[PDB]
RNA sequence: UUUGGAGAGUUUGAUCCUGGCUCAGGACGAACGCUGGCGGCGUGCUUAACACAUGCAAGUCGAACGGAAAGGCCCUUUCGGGGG
């Protein structure tokens, strides 16, 4: 059930003795819709083969996204070559609101509620890399408290833990109709 | 202890970056074009502090005053009017 999302298709041109020898590049994000996401860049003579290579590269380099509900743990500004993407968590119902690249990677990760904004290098590839760098900079409170050597309560805020418990209930207790 | 940022196109054979230009949105004391049924609530010289016909826009008090021109009342009466 992996959700896949192409963001950009570009006809690139090598030049040779005869002339322009073309190919196609597909930027394909794929995700589980629940927090695992991967990015791929497929380069191939034909568009569908490019997309397939992108899918394969993505499913190879999947990575897991920290979440507290259907948003992210904390705000974070990821940088790439020159893509700069701030991410800011958001209350539920405001909706993932972002440009098509950040939007695609977030929607494939399953982040339905988030604030995002590209601040440099409108190019979708570097934007996606910047967004991914942000998501990799993300830090779940459990591993944070481990990193500190403390409880979770005295490093994380009560609002985050409230939403955490709420989401955990709505996951487990509401998985009853799926498990039975 | 609550909150709220979307991008796209365009330099190149193609790429990335920078960088500008443009667009998508919202608003208006608005104007124009096409069109036009109803109501409600508002709103209307943003320019010539340019010139202005005309009519109204600051009067009131007779319990401040002399008074009595118009009405009123009463005497008068040639019914013309005259007095208080």
Swiss-Prot record:
GO terms for molecular function: rRNA binding; structural constituent of ribosome. The keyword Chloroplast does not apply. Residues 2-65 form the S5 DRBM domain. GO terms for biological process: translation. With S4 and S12 plays an important role in translational accuracy. Part of the 30S ribosomal subunit. Contacts proteins S4 and S8. It comes from Mycolicibacterium smegmatis (strain ATCC 700084 / mc(2)155) (Mycobacterium smegmatis). Keywords: Ribonucleoprotein, Ribosomal protein, RNA-binding, rRNA-binding. The N-terminal domain interacts with the head of the 30S subunit; the C-terminal domain interacts with the body and contacts protein S4. The interaction surface between S4 and S5 is involved in control of translational fidelity. The lineage of its organism: Bacteria, Bacillati, Actinomycetota, Actinomycetes, Mycobacteriales. Belongs to the universal ribosomal protein uS5 family. One of its GO terms (cellular component) is small ribosomal subunit. This is Small ribosomal subunit protein uS5.
